[PDB]
Amino acid sequence: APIDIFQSILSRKSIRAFTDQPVTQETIREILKLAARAPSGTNLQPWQVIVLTGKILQKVGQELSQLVLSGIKGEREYHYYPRQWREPYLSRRRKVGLDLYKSLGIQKGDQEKMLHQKAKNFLFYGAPVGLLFTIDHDMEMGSWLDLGMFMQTIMLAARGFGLDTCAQAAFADYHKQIRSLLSVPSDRHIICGMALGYRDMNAPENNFETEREPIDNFVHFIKSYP
Amino acid sequence: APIDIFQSILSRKSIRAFTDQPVTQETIREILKLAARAPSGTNLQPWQVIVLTGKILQKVGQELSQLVLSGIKGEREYHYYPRQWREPYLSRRRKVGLDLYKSLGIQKGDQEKMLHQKAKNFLFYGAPVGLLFTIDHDMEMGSWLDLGMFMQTIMLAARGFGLDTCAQAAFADYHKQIRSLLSVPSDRHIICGMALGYRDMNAPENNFETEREPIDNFVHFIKSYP
Ligand SMILES: Cc1cc2nc3c(=O)[nH]c(=O)nc-3n(C[C@H](O)[C@H](O)[C@H](O)COP(=O)(O)O)c2cc1C
Ligand SMILES: Cc1cc2nc3c(=O)[nH]c(=O)nc-3n(C[C@H](O)[C@H](O)[C@H](O)COP(=O)(O)O)c2cc1C
Ligand SMILES: [Cl-]
Ligand SMILES: [Cl-]
């Protein structure tokens, strides 16, 4: 009896601490076969995945964490977040960041703690599987919708196996080093990553709540005309 | 007892013919509340939705389909699809297009049938609910990942209610006309639409299959270092 679609949606959260329980290769393959059944414009299936486990996962994570801790600034190819920050987006970002820091006992402005927490991103938060997503250079903006559809399918499918995830744009910061480490072909662009693994159930960062906007704040229902 | 997550993922298909059964506002709201639980970078939740039913849905479909049938060309404000078409993308697009046409009995050279079939997009394929998605002008690329995540959550949640969908970039063709008809504020951009409804299980266009790439075509598994 697998979990139901609604249970998958509601139980999915961003998990940032994992146990050392390994994920079988067969489970990873089945998750990705399910995700490949995401829709995409004219069935182009633009998603490309790199799966890191074992020694190479540890090497990549440790090398990228050291770039952060060494003070090497990120350099992204694309703009992910707003260039002009304003409300209500300001407050949404501020709340989840403050709630994460509170769970970890980090005071705002403690730069040493903030940096060490940031660096954990690049270890995929200690997950036993690290996923990186790339797309071909000829792809346009539609393919980013497609990629989000594919990634959410991974995240929901994972719940079917009792697995957890964290989507991670952090990796975009070090696309040049990732390209070097993994010999990523020049015609592919690294878009983002995702941690996959079994949650550390009692880690405090896995036990806070996130809000969402009430639907009438972002949905306009229309029926009448004129 | 809702369907399981895997059944939702695999049974989802792009449905292009619907019954005349309406969808309750309660069910639309439930679907959107579930979709709101998609993840987004820093919980920005950039998605905005316009839900069309009843008279206004009929009117939008009428106006936009008549633009197609009258010869009025689309003008998109973004590039959704590649500007340079190459293999393997070319074959993927051609195969789904040829299989749709085959299901419909549309032969090479049937220009009026092809125009008719294209125009059906703009009626949301006859669905009782039409969705349009917008995002704020300050949002950047990342928000397209987020919107994709949200949209696929709709599509999968819908299966839990016995409903079906078709994601549709087609509406981007007539963003100017949609903005005027629905008074979409100037700081929001129309990204794409989606049909929602009960599939017509007898319609031939709902009774073909789409391919997906085998996972070795696009997943690279790496474990060893070096
Ligand atoms: C972002 C996006 C835009 C799409 N645009 C259209 C569209 O305008 N009209 C249409 O009939 N199908 C559209 N499709 C549906 C795809 O053709 C379909 O997802 C693909 O061929 C795979 O088939 P499946 O969804 O049945 O698995 C779109 C799908 C996506 C994800
Ligand atoms: C595209 C995308 C990129 C994200 N990037 C990161 C990241 O780099 N690091 C991180 O800890 N969380 C990241 N997040 C997770 C979000 O912060 C999280 O989804 C949001 O706060 C809502 O919380 P939830 O996923 O627990 O519901 C990302 C999420 C998305 C969708
Ligand atoms: Cl950014
Ligand atoms: Cl386009």
Short mmCIF file of C-alpha atoms and ligand atoms in Angstrom, two decimals:
data_model
loop_
_atom_site.label_atom_id
_atom_site.label_comp_id
_atom_site.label_asym_id
_atom_site.label_seq_id
_atom_site.Cartn_x
_atom_site.Cartn_y
_atom_site.Cartn_z
CA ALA A 1 0.00 0.00 0.00
CA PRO A 2 1.92 3.07 -1.19
CA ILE A 3 1.09 6.50 0.09
CA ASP A 4 -1.53 8.44 -1.78
CA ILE A 5 -1.02 11.38 -4.02
CA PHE A 6 -2.34 13.91 -1.41
CA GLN A 7 -0.18 12.37 1.32
CA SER A 8 2.86 12.73 -0.91
CA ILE A 9 2.13 16.41 -1.62
CA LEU A 10 1.42 17.31 2.00
CA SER A 11 4.33 15.31 3.54
CA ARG A 12 7.02 16.55 1.17
CA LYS A 13 9.27 19.12 2.79
CA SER A 14 12.77 20.42 2.24
CA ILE A 15 14.99 18.14 4.35
CA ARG A 16 18.41 19.39 5.32
CA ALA A 17 19.77 16.61 7.46
CA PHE A 18 19.92 12.93 6.43
CA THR A 19 20.96 9.63 7.98
CA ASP A 20 23.62 7.38 6.45
CA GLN A 21 20.99 4.88 5.26
CA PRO A 22 21.94 4.13 1.63
CA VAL A 23 19.49 4.42 -1.32
CA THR A 24 19.54 1.38 -3.55
CA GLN A 25 20.43 1.89 -7.20
CA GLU A 26 17.13 0.25 -8.18
CA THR A 27 15.18 2.80 -6.13
CA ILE A 28 17.09 5.73 -7.68
CA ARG A 29 16.37 4.27 -11.17
CA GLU A 30 12.68 3.83 -10.45
CA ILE A 31 12.33 7.36 -9.13
CA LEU A 32 13.97 8.75 -12.27
CA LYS A 33 11.83 6.52 -14.58
CA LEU A 34 8.73 7.95 -12.81
CA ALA A 35 10.02 11.52 -13.09
CA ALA A 36 10.69 11.01 -16.85
CA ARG A 37 6.85 10.70 -17.14
CA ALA A 38 6.53 14.38 -16.32
CA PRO A 39 5.02 16.30 -19.24
CA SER A 40 7.13 18.68 -21.30
CA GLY A 41 6.46 20.98 -24.27
CA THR A 42 6.15 18.82 -27.43
CA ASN A 43 7.55 15.96 -25.30
CA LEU A 44 11.06 17.39 -25.65
CA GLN A 45 12.10 15.92 -22.25
CA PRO A 46 14.95 18.43 -21.89
CA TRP A 47 16.08 17.19 -18.46
CA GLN A 48 19.47 15.61 -18.02
CA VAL A 49 20.56 14.20 -14.64
CA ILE A 50 23.90 13.44 -13.05
CA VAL A 51 23.66 11.04 -10.08
CA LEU A 52 26.46 11.16 -7.51
CA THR A 53 26.93 8.50 -4.81
CA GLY A 54 29.81 7.04 -2.87
CA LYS A 55 33.29 8.40 -3.24
CA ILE A 56 32.59 10.91 -5.98
CA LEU A 57 29.66 12.35 -3.99
CA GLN A 58 31.98 12.83 -1.01
CA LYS A 59 34.73 14.37 -3.21
CA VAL A 60 32.43 16.80 -5.00
CA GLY A 61 30.71 17.81 -1.77
CA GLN A 62 33.87 18.29 0.16
CA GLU A 63 35.54 20.28 -2.63
CA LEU A 64 32.54 22.62 -3.13
CA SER A 65 32.02 23.13 0.64
CA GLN A 66 35.67 24.20 0.83
CA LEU A 67 35.09 26.85 -1.92
CA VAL A 68 32.40 28.44 0.30
CA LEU A 69 34.43 28.23 3.46
CA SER A 70 37.45 29.65 1.66
CA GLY A 71 35.47 32.76 0.66
CA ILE A 72 35.32 32.05 -3.08
CA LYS A 73 32.23 33.97 -4.29
CA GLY A 74 29.60 32.22 -6.31
CA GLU A 75 29.20 33.11 -9.97
CA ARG A 76 25.90 32.09 -11.53
CA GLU A 77 25.14 31.91 -15.28
CA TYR A 78 21.51 32.89 -14.78
CA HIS A 79 19.43 35.05 -12.50
CA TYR A 80 17.40 32.80 -10.23
CA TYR A 81 15.97 35.27 -7.72
CA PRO A 82 14.66 38.78 -8.14
CA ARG A 83 17.26 41.48 -8.79
CA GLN A 84 14.86 44.00 -7.19
CA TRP A 85 13.64 42.60 -3.87
CA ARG A 86 10.30 43.83 -2.60
CA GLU A 87 7.17 42.79 -0.70
CA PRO A 88 5.53 40.30 -0.38
CA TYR A 89 8.56 38.30 -1.57
CA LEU A 90 10.88 39.95 1.00
CA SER A 91 8.75 38.73 3.93
CA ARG A 92 8.38 35.18 2.55
CA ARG A 93 12.15 34.80 2.17
CA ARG A 94 12.82 36.40 5.56
CA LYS A 95 10.43 34.07 7.39
CA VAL A 96 11.78 30.73 6.12
CA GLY A 97 15.38 31.91 6.60
CA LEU A 98 14.69 33.10 10.17
CA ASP A 99 12.83 29.87 10.96
CA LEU A 100 15.69 27.76 9.65
CA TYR A 101 18.23 29.77 11.65
CA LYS A 102 16.09 29.58 14.79
CA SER A 103 15.93 25.78 14.48
CA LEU A 104 19.74 25.72 14.33
CA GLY A 105 20.38 28.31 17.05
CA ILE A 106 21.97 30.76 14.62
CA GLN A 107 21.63 34.45 15.43
CA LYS A 108 21.14 36.71 12.41
CA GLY A 109 24.49 38.30 11.54
CA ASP A 110 26.68 35.50 13.07
CA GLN A 111 28.71 35.16 9.93
CA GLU A 112 30.74 32.13 10.99
CA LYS A 113 27.64 30.12 11.72
CA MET A 114 25.85 31.39 8.65
CA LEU A 115 28.79 30.39 6.45
CA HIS A 116 29.05 26.90 7.93
CA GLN A 117 25.35 26.36 7.39
CA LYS A 118 25.56 27.70 3.82
CA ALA A 119 28.48 25.35 3.13
CA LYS A 120 26.35 22.34 4.09
CA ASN A 121 24.33 22.91 0.94
CA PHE A 122 27.30 21.78 -1.16
CA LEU A 123 27.45 18.43 0.69
CA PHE A 124 23.81 17.99 -0.42
CA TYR A 125 23.10 18.38 3.30
CA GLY A 126 24.86 15.06 3.91
CA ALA A 127 22.48 13.04 1.73
CA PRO A 128 23.64 9.73 0.30
CA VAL A 129 22.59 10.76 -3.21
CA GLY A 130 23.31 14.05 -4.93
CA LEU A 131 21.47 14.99 -8.11
CA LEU A 132 22.59 17.69 -10.57
CA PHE A 133 20.34 18.82 -13.40
CA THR A 134 21.55 20.11 -16.73
CA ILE A 135 19.91 21.15 -20.01
CA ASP A 136 21.19 21.61 -23.52
CA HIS A 137 22.37 25.10 -24.56
CA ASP A 138 19.77 25.30 -27.43
CA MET A 139 16.90 25.10 -24.92
CA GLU A 140 14.81 28.21 -24.14
CA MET A 141 12.62 29.33 -21.21
CA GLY A 142 9.94 26.65 -21.71
CA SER A 143 12.43 24.04 -20.75
CA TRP A 144 12.67 25.58 -17.28
CA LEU A 145 8.95 24.90 -16.76
CA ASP A 146 9.60 21.36 -17.94
CA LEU A 147 12.57 20.94 -15.60
CA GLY A 148 10.47 22.13 -12.60
CA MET A 149 7.81 19.60 -13.53
CA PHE A 150 10.44 16.84 -13.65
CA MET A 151 12.01 17.90 -10.34
CA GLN A 152 8.68 18.05 -8.48
CA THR A 153 7.90 14.59 -9.85
CA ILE A 154 11.16 13.31 -8.28
CA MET A 155 10.26 14.94 -4.98
CA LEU A 156 6.79 13.44 -4.90
CA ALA A 157 7.81 10.07 -6.20
CA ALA A 158 10.49 9.94 -3.46
CA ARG A 159 7.74 10.14 -0.83
CA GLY A 160 6.38 6.90 -2.30
CA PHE A 161 9.56 5.22 -1.14
CA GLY A 162 9.72 6.94 2.23
CA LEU A 163 12.51 9.17 0.87
CA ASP A 164 13.08 12.90 1.20
CA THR A 165 14.60 15.64 -0.88
CA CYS A 166 15.84 19.24 -0.91
CA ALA A 167 15.83 21.22 -4.16
CA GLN A 168 19.00 23.27 -4.29
CA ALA A 169 19.83 26.25 -6.52
CA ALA A 170 23.01 26.69 -4.46
CA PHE A 171 24.97 24.50 -6.89
CA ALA A 172 24.54 27.14 -9.65
CA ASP A 173 27.09 29.21 -7.71
CA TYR A 174 29.93 26.87 -8.71
CA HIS A 175 28.93 25.67 -12.13
CA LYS A 176 32.49 26.23 -13.40
CA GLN A 177 34.03 23.92 -10.77
CA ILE A 178 31.30 21.36 -11.15
CA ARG A 179 31.93 21.32 -14.92
CA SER A 180 35.63 20.68 -14.24
CA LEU A 181 35.06 18.01 -11.55
CA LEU A 182 32.55 15.98 -13.57
CA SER A 183 33.69 16.73 -17.16
CA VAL A 184 30.28 18.12 -18.02
CA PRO A 185 30.10 18.67 -21.81
CA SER A 186 30.35 22.34 -22.78
CA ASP A 187 26.95 22.34 -24.54
CA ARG A 188 25.13 21.49 -21.29
CA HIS A 189 24.34 24.02 -18.62
CA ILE A 190 24.12 23.17 -14.92
CA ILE A 191 20.82 24.55 -13.62
CA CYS A 192 20.57 23.26 -10.01
CA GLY A 193 20.85 20.27 -7.75
CA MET A 194 18.81 18.20 -5.33
CA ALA A 195 19.63 16.15 -2.22
CA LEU A 196 17.97 12.70 -1.95
CA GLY A 197 17.99 10.47 1.08
CA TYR A 198 16.33 9.29 4.27
CA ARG A 199 15.64 12.16 6.67
CA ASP A 200 17.26 12.46 10.08
CA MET A 201 13.88 12.59 11.74
CA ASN A 202 15.01 14.32 14.94
CA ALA A 203 17.33 16.98 13.45
CA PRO A 204 15.76 20.32 14.52
CA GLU A 205 16.08 21.75 11.00
CA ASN A 206 13.73 19.00 9.81
CA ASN A 207 11.08 19.96 12.38
CA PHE A 208 9.90 23.46 11.64
CA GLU A 209 6.90 24.47 9.59
CA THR A 210 6.68 26.57 6.42
CA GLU A 211 3.67 28.75 5.61
CA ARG A 212 1.87 29.14 2.34
CA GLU A 213 -0.33 31.98 1.11
CA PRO A 214 -4.08 31.42 1.24
CA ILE A 215 -5.24 30.57 -2.27
CA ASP A 216 -7.50 33.66 -2.57
CA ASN A 217 -4.30 35.78 -2.21
CA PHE A 218 -2.95 34.43 -5.52
CA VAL A 219 -6.01 33.03 -7.41
CA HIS A 220 -8.63 35.12 -9.19
CA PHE A 221 -11.76 33.10 -9.92
CA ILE A 222 -13.86 34.50 -12.77
CA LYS A 223 -17.21 33.22 -14.14
CA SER A 224 -19.39 36.11 -15.33
CA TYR A 225 -19.29 37.87 -18.67
CA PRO A 226 -19.85 40.71 -19.49
CA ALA B 1 -9.22 6.00 -0.65
CA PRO B 2 -7.31 8.23 -3.10
CA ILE B 3 -5.05 6.71 -5.79
CA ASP B 4 -1.38 6.17 -4.92
CA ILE B 5 1.39 8.47 -5.90
CA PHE B 6 2.80 6.20 -8.58
CA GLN B 7 -0.58 5.68 -10.23
CA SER B 8 -1.08 9.46 -10.28
CA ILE B 9 2.29 10.03 -11.99
CA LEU B 10 1.83 7.30 -14.58
CA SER B 11 -1.88 7.74 -15.35
CA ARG B 12 -1.51 11.52 -16.00
CA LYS B 13 -1.57 12.30 -19.72
CA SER B 14 -2.34 15.34 -21.79
CA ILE B 15 -6.05 15.14 -22.40
CA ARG B 16 -7.46 17.03 -25.37
CA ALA B 17 -11.13 16.16 -25.20
CA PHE B 18 -13.39 16.47 -22.15
CA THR B 19 -16.91 15.60 -21.12
CA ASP B 20 -19.47 18.30 -20.32
CA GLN B 21 -19.35 17.44 -16.59
CA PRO B 22 -18.49 20.56 -14.59
CA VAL B 23 -15.90 20.66 -11.82
CA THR B 24 -17.09 22.01 -8.51
CA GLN B 25 -15.51 25.14 -7.16
CA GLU B 26 -14.74 23.12 -4.00
CA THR B 27 -12.67 20.63 -6.00
CA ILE B 28 -10.82 23.39 -7.89
CA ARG B 29 -10.01 25.07 -4.56
CA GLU B 30 -8.79 21.80 -3.04
CA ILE B 31 -6.51 21.15 -6.02
CA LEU B 32 -5.04 24.67 -5.77
CA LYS B 33 -4.53 24.35 -1.97
CA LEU B 34 -2.51 21.20 -2.61
CA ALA B 35 -0.57 22.87 -5.42
CA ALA B 36 0.25 25.79 -3.08
CA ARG B 37 2.37 23.26 -1.13
CA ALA B 38 4.84 22.96 -3.97
CA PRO B 39 8.30 24.10 -3.02
CA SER B 40 9.78 27.34 -4.39
CA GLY B 41 13.10 29.13 -3.97
CA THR B 42 13.13 30.82 -0.55
CA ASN B 43 9.37 30.00 -0.41
CA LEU B 44 8.66 32.95 -2.77
CA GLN B 45 5.56 31.19 -4.17
CA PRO B 46 5.63 33.24 -7.42
CA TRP B 47 2.66 31.51 -8.96
CA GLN B 48 -0.55 33.44 -9.66
CA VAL B 49 -3.60 31.77 -11.20
CA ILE B 50 -6.75 32.93 -13.05
CA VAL B 51 -9.51 30.33 -12.95
CA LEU B 52 -12.09 30.57 -15.75
CA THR B 53 -15.44 28.79 -15.76
CA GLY B 54 -18.91 29.35 -17.13
CA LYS B 55 -19.63 32.36 -19.31
CA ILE B 56 -16.20 33.93 -19.17
CA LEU B 57 -14.53 30.61 -20.08
CA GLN B 58 -16.88 30.34 -23.06
CA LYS B 59 -16.10 33.92 -24.11
CA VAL B 60 -12.33 33.57 -23.86
CA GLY B 61 -12.46 30.38 -25.88
CA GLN B 62 -14.66 32.00 -28.50
CA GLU B 63 -12.54 35.10 -28.87
CA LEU B 64 -9.18 33.33 -29.01
CA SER B 65 -10.25 30.41 -31.26
CA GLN B 66 -11.73 32.95 -33.68
CA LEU B 67 -8.36 34.74 -33.85
CA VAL B 68 -6.81 31.43 -34.98
CA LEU B 69 -9.56 30.65 -37.53
CA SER B 70 -9.40 34.15 -38.93
CA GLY B 71 -5.64 34.06 -39.59
CA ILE B 72 -4.40 36.29 -36.76
CA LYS B 73 -0.82 35.32 -35.92
CA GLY B 74 0.44 34.82 -32.38
CA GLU B 75 3.02 37.13 -30.78
CA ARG B 76 4.80 35.56 -27.78
CA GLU B 77 6.78 37.64 -25.40
CA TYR B 78 9.12 34.78 -24.45
CA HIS B 79 10.85 31.99 -26.34
CA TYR B 80 9.38 28.73 -25.11
CA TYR B 81 10.88 26.34 -27.66
CA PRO B 82 14.30 26.11 -29.21
CA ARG B 83 15.20 28.68 -31.90
CA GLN B 84 17.51 26.03 -33.44
CA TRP B 85 15.90 22.60 -33.86
CA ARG B 86 18.26 19.60 -33.82
CA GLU B 87 18.03 15.93 -33.03
CA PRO B 88 16.96 14.41 -30.73
CA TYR B 89 14.42 17.18 -30.05
CA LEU B 90 13.16 17.30 -33.59
CA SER B 91 12.20 13.61 -33.57
CA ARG B 92 10.50 13.87 -30.17
CA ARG B 93 8.32 16.76 -31.36
CA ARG B 94 7.53 15.08 -34.67
CA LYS B 95 6.51 11.79 -33.09
CA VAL B 96 3.96 13.24 -30.64
CA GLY B 97 2.57 15.51 -33.38
CA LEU B 98 2.25 12.69 -35.88
CA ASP B 99 0.61 10.44 -33.28
CA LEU B 100 -1.93 13.13 -32.32
CA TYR B 101 -2.76 13.68 -36.00
CA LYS B 102 -3.01 9.94 -36.60
CA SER B 103 -5.50 9.60 -33.74
CA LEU B 104 -7.59 12.40 -35.29
CA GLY B 105 -7.40 11.15 -38.90
CA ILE B 106 -5.48 14.27 -39.98
CA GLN B 107 -3.45 13.55 -43.10
CA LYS B 108 -0.54 15.40 -44.71
CA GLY B 109 -2.02 18.42 -46.53
CA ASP B 110 -5.26 18.73 -44.51
CA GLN B 111 -4.58 22.43 -43.79
CA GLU B 112 -8.16 23.24 -42.63
CA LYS B 113 -8.18 20.27 -40.25
CA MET B 114 -4.79 21.27 -38.90
CA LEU B 115 -5.99 24.87 -38.35
CA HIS B 116 -9.18 23.56 -36.65
CA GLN B 117 -7.17 21.32 -34.35
CA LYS B 118 -4.81 24.12 -33.47
CA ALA B 119 -7.75 26.43 -32.68
CA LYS B 120 -9.12 23.86 -30.18
CA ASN B 121 -6.25 24.78 -27.86
CA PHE B 122 -7.78 28.13 -27.27
CA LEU B 123 -11.02 26.58 -26.00
CA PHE B 124 -8.91 24.67 -23.46
CA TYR B 125 -9.90 21.65 -25.59
CA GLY B 126 -13.48 22.08 -24.39
CA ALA B 127 -12.68 21.63 -20.69
CA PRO B 128 -15.08 23.08 -18.09
CA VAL B 129 -12.19 24.85 -16.33
CA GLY B 130 -9.45 26.90 -17.92
CA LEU B 131 -6.41 28.00 -15.87
CA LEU B 132 -4.00 30.78 -16.76
CA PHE B 133 -0.69 31.27 -14.89
CA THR B 134 0.98 34.62 -14.37
CA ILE B 135 4.03 35.80 -12.51
CA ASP B 136 5.21 39.23 -11.36
CA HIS B 137 7.50 41.25 -13.68
CA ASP B 138 10.35 41.29 -11.07
CA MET B 139 10.67 37.52 -11.05
CA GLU B 140 13.68 35.92 -12.79
CA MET B 141 14.48 32.41 -14.22
CA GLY B 142 14.17 30.56 -10.97
CA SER B 143 10.50 31.35 -10.82
CA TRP B 144 9.94 29.34 -14.00
CA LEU B 145 11.28 26.23 -12.16
CA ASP B 146 8.91 27.08 -9.30
CA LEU B 147 5.91 27.56 -11.66
CA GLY B 148 6.65 24.18 -13.29
CA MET B 149 6.66 22.53 -9.86
CA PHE B 150 3.35 24.14 -9.04
CA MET B 151 1.78 23.16 -12.36
CA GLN B 152 2.83 19.52 -12.13
CA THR B 153 1.40 19.46 -8.56
CA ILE B 154 -1.95 20.54 -10.05
CA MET B 155 -1.76 17.88 -12.73
CA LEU B 156 -0.96 15.13 -10.24
CA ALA B 157 -3.46 16.31 -7.60
CA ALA B 158 -6.11 16.39 -10.30
CA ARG B 159 -5.67 12.64 -10.85
CA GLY B 160 -6.56 12.16 -7.19
CA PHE B 161 -9.94 13.67 -7.89
CA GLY B 162 -10.49 11.63 -11.02
CA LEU B 163 -9.77 14.69 -13.16
CA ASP B 164 -7.35 15.41 -16.02
CA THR B 165 -5.36 18.21 -17.50
CA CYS B 166 -3.46 19.52 -20.48
CA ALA B 167 -0.66 22.03 -19.93
CA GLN B 168 -0.77 24.61 -22.73
CA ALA B 169 1.80 27.09 -23.85
CA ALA B 170 -0.53 27.99 -26.71
CA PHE B 171 -2.09 30.82 -24.76
CA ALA B 172 1.17 32.74 -24.82
CA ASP B 173 0.40 33.46 -28.52
CA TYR B 174 -2.37 35.85 -27.46
CA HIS B 175 -1.13 37.36 -24.20
CA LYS B 176 -2.07 40.88 -25.37
CA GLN B 177 -5.68 39.88 -26.08
CA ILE B 178 -5.98 37.90 -22.80
CA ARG B 179 -4.64 40.88 -20.79
CA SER B 180 -7.30 43.12 -22.34
CA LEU B 181 -10.20 40.67 -21.94
CA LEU B 182 -9.38 39.74 -18.29
CA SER B 183 -7.83 43.09 -17.16
CA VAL B 184 -4.60 41.41 -16.14
CA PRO B 185 -2.59 44.04 -14.28
CA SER B 186 0.44 45.40 -16.15
CA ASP B 187 3.05 44.16 -13.66
CA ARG B 188 2.06 40.50 -14.27
CA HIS B 189 3.00 38.38 -17.26
CA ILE B 190 0.99 35.55 -18.71
CA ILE B 191 3.17 32.47 -18.91
CA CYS B 192 0.83 29.68 -20.05
CA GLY B 193 -2.46 27.91 -19.46
CA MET B 194 -3.94 24.59 -18.55
CA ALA B 195 -7.16 22.76 -19.27
CA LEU B 196 -8.85 20.94 -16.36
CA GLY B 197 -11.80 18.57 -16.49
CA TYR B 198 -13.10 15.03 -16.83
CA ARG B 199 -11.53 13.26 -19.80
CA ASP B 200 -13.72 11.90 -22.56
CA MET B 201 -12.57 8.31 -22.33
CA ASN B 202 -13.93 7.57 -25.86
CA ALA B 203 -12.22 10.38 -27.72
CA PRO B 204 -9.50 8.99 -30.01
CA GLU B 205 -7.02 11.75 -29.08
CA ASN B 206 -7.16 10.51 -25.51
CA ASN B 207 -6.39 6.91 -26.51
CA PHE B 208 -2.81 7.01 -27.77
CA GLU B 209 0.46 6.67 -25.95
CA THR B 210 3.52 8.89 -25.70
CA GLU B 211 7.13 7.64 -25.53
CA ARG B 212 9.78 8.56 -22.99
CA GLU B 213 13.53 8.20 -23.25
CA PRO B 214 15.15 5.25 -21.50
CA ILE B 215 16.97 6.57 -18.45
CA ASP B 216 20.49 5.74 -19.75
CA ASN B 217 19.93 8.23 -22.56
CA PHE B 218 19.88 11.11 -20.10
CA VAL B 219 21.03 9.99 -16.61
CA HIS B 220 24.78 9.64 -15.91
CA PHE B 221 25.53 7.61 -12.80
CA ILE B 222 28.91 8.34 -11.26
CA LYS B 223 30.39 6.81 -8.03
CA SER B 224 34.17 6.51 -8.42
CA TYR B 225 36.78 9.14 -7.63
CA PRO B 226 38.94 9.46 -9.65
C1 LIG C 1 4.99 23.58 -20.64
C2 LIG C 1 4.08 22.75 -21.58
C3 LIG C 1 3.41 23.35 -22.65
C4 LIG C 1 2.60 22.52 -23.47
N1 LIG C 1 1.91 23.13 -24.50
C5 LIG C 1 0.88 22.43 -25.13
C6 LIG C 1 -0.03 23.10 -25.96
O1 LIG C 1 -0.03 24.32 -26.17
N2 LIG C 1 -0.98 22.31 -26.55
C7 LIG C 1 -1.01 20.97 -26.37
O2 LIG C 1 -1.90 20.34 -26.99
N3 LIG C 1 -0.16 20.29 -25.59
C8 LIG C 1 0.78 21.04 -24.92
N4 LIG C 1 1.65 20.41 -24.08
C9 LIG C 1 1.51 18.97 -23.78
C10 LIG C 1 2.68 18.14 -24.25
O3 LIG C 1 2.56 18.00 -25.67
C11 LIG C 1 2.70 16.75 -23.60
O4 LIG C 1 2.96 16.96 -22.23
C12 LIG C 1 3.77 15.81 -24.17
O5 LIG C 1 3.56 15.53 -25.56
C13 LIG C 1 3.82 14.51 -23.38
O6 LIG C 1 2.53 13.85 -23.43
P1 LIG C 1 1.76 13.48 -22.08
O7 LIG C 1 1.54 14.75 -21.27
O8 LIG C 1 0.44 12.88 -22.57
O9 LIG C 1 2.60 12.50 -21.26
C14 LIG C 1 2.46 21.16 -23.22
C15 LIG C 1 3.13 20.59 -22.14
C16 LIG C 1 3.95 21.38 -21.32
C17 LIG C 1 4.67 20.75 -20.13
C1 LIG C 2 14.21 25.90 -7.27
C2 LIG C 2 14.47 25.78 -5.78
C3 LIG C 2 15.74 26.07 -5.27
C4 LIG C 2 15.93 25.97 -3.89
N1 LIG C 2 17.21 26.23 -3.45
C5 LIG C 2 17.54 25.87 -2.16
C6 LIG C 2 18.90 25.85 -1.72
O1 LIG C 2 19.84 26.12 -2.48
N2 LIG C 2 19.13 25.50 -0.44
C7 LIG C 2 18.16 25.19 0.47
O2 LIG C 2 18.43 24.89 1.64
N3 LIG C 2 16.84 25.20 0.04
C8 LIG C 2 16.55 25.54 -1.23
N4 LIG C 2 15.22 25.48 -1.61
C9 LIG C 2 14.13 24.94 -0.72
C10 LIG C 2 13.16 26.05 -0.42
O3 LIG C 2 13.78 26.93 0.55
C11 LIG C 2 11.88 25.47 0.17
O4 LIG C 2 11.27 24.69 -0.90
C12 LIG C 2 10.83 26.49 0.61
O5 LIG C 2 11.39 27.25 1.70
C13 LIG C 2 9.56 25.84 1.12
O6 LIG C 2 9.81 24.84 2.13
P1 LIG C 2 9.39 23.30 1.90
O7 LIG C 2 10.07 22.79 0.66
O8 LIG C 2 9.87 22.66 3.17
O9 LIG C 2 7.83 23.28 1.77
C14 LIG C 2 14.96 25.56 -3.00
C15 LIG C 2 13.68 25.26 -3.52
C16 LIG C 2 13.47 25.38 -4.88
C17 LIG C 2 12.09 25.03 -5.44
CL CL C 3 20.21 34.49 -8.37
CL CL C 4 8.28 29.71 -28.64
#
